[PDB]
Amino acid sequence: SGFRKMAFPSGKVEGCMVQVTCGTTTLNGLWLDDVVYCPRHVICTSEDMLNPNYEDLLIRKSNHNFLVQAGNVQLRVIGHSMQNCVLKLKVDTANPKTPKYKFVRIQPGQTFSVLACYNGSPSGVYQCAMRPNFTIKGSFLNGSCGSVGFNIDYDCVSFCYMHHMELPTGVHAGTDLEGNFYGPFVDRQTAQAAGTDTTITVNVLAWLYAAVINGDRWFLNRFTTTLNDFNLVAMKYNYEPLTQDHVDILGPLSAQTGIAVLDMCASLKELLQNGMNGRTILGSALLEDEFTPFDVVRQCSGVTF
Amino acid sequence: SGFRKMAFPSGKVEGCMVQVTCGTTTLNGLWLDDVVYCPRHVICTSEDMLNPNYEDLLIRKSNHNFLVQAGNVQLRVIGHSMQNCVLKLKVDTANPKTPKYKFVRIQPGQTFSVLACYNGSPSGVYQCAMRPNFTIKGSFLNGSCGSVGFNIDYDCVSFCYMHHMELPTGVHAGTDLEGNFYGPFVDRQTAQAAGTDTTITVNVLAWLYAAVINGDRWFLNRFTTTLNDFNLVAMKYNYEPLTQDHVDILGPLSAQTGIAVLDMCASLKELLQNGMNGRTILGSALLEDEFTPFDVVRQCSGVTF
Ligand SMILES: O=C1CCN(Cc2cc(Cl)cs2)C(=O)N1Cc1ccc[nH]c1=O
Ligand SMILES: O=C1CCN(Cc2cc(Cl)cs2)C(=O)N1Cc1ccc[nH]c1=O
């Protein structure tokens, strides 16, 4: 019993973090097989960051301009390339600790664990979500660039996120492991519009199911609703529209609690139109949307890796 | 910027988790050097759990009754003893992955990371606090017994918690690594009084400092107060009394934000007597007491391990 923001165990990722140094800049890299992946703005001085010509700047750099440290084992770089917004350093040594892994582009609303890192050394781990507007609300200080987000299925690490940027608004932006930014962002020191966010409806409902599994049942009502009627409520409260796909994803939680999906939408409706009255659900006084239905099932059933 | 419940990276602990099997029971153990530590109720059948005679039950067990699995490496048990509420299995093999480590008894209000585990395999990691009443509010399912809580300073793992028990109230109880329960609890299937909890005042204030560091400044008032006057407010709202020790611990955050401790107590006072008005502080609509001042300094300054 109980429900926490739980991250994946990070050991498999810890053995892949290295320090990457080019000119005056240092940030984190990810060392898998004989390749290190890091944000391409490692090649920039602070002057370059207003409008960098990455091609032109990369041309001035050779293999020996890149220092990769893995603890103390200084790796030797024997090849370099830019793929979108990441740099790929070919090193003479495959990582003895390389896990089975996949590069993935996650979808808005999916969650992952972040291993926040500084000078190639892990600092802490926490869970969060790709927002509908393709930002993440993280905890990242200067030097955390190249920290990665990930999921773990059994023994397989799916890397989905590399940190590039704090927006002047205090939220975070970054790329998949191919170097393509999530969202409209670019790797320049400029103000950049995130655009309107929404709340991840299917995740709130899954959290409502988690609450019922743990004995928090007070928001369970006697009303029901329809998908379209609820979607009327969702649009007004800046919630994502709920589709039959979402209803199917929630089927297993529906069945384990015996509360139909549309019935639990009827409770969410009341919570939206009437608030919480200063009560709490699973210890929070707000509706939480950073648990996917899988996150809930994994925690209330106990899946290991 | 940003502030999250952040756990320590768990890799050092992951390499120590093993499965421990005695009779019909299986739970997690912690393998350091040539000794495995696990809850002593591994030797109990479900009948025994109402009022077990642990001495008498342990007498019926020999070295070969204990199966320790570390992945697949079945370790061989060559010695066994009970220390308080833990069992210590002497195994023929020192753990190649033993980290530098200490056993510690933490104090109420201190925090630690839990690596929740099932059948000796890690499931997820999260942060929490030893409550004033010596329970923890965790996420633990059946089979999570023997999961451990810990802190990490540089390269040193301080183990502070081993999970034994979910109370019929849905909260969690357990021992230090010497086998002594935190709190009044015992390892029997009986209803057990946790006793009145309180809120950890010095932790709320540290979180208030974290909020000011991240730009959430709206609760900053123009009033001040005195330690005794504030303590009047604390006692009424079931907050722990604030002492000069706590004020000294907060000195570094006071200095970095330039807000005197007693001034920030004056804001906490207003928040307690008047609530939040449906606004939020660092994304929460409640006062958060599971960040120590060190937790805050480590996150808003970026300490690594
Ligand atoms: O480390 C750095 C260095 C430079 N820089 C600025 C730009 C990077 C990109 Cl690409 C375009 S502009 C940045 O954003 N970070 C991340 C970061 C900084 C402060 C608090 N939290 C953070 O995550
Ligand atoms: O795994 C077990 C097995 C038996 N058992 C009952 C007693 C143990 C002690 Cl000592 C005295 S009575 C227990 O409490 N757990 C932990 C647990 C169970 C269900 C949800 N969450 C949990 O943590």
Numbering used by the authors:
A (entry chain A), B (entry chain A): 1 to 305
Sentences from the study reporting this entry:
Proteolytic processing of the SARS-CoV-2 polyprotein is essential for viral replication and depends on the action of nsp5 (1, 2), which encodes the main protease (MPro), also referred to as 3C-like protease (3CLPro).
To inform further optimization of this scaffold, the x-ray crystal structure of the low-micromolar inhibitor AVI-3318 in complex with MPro was determined to 1.96 Å resolution.
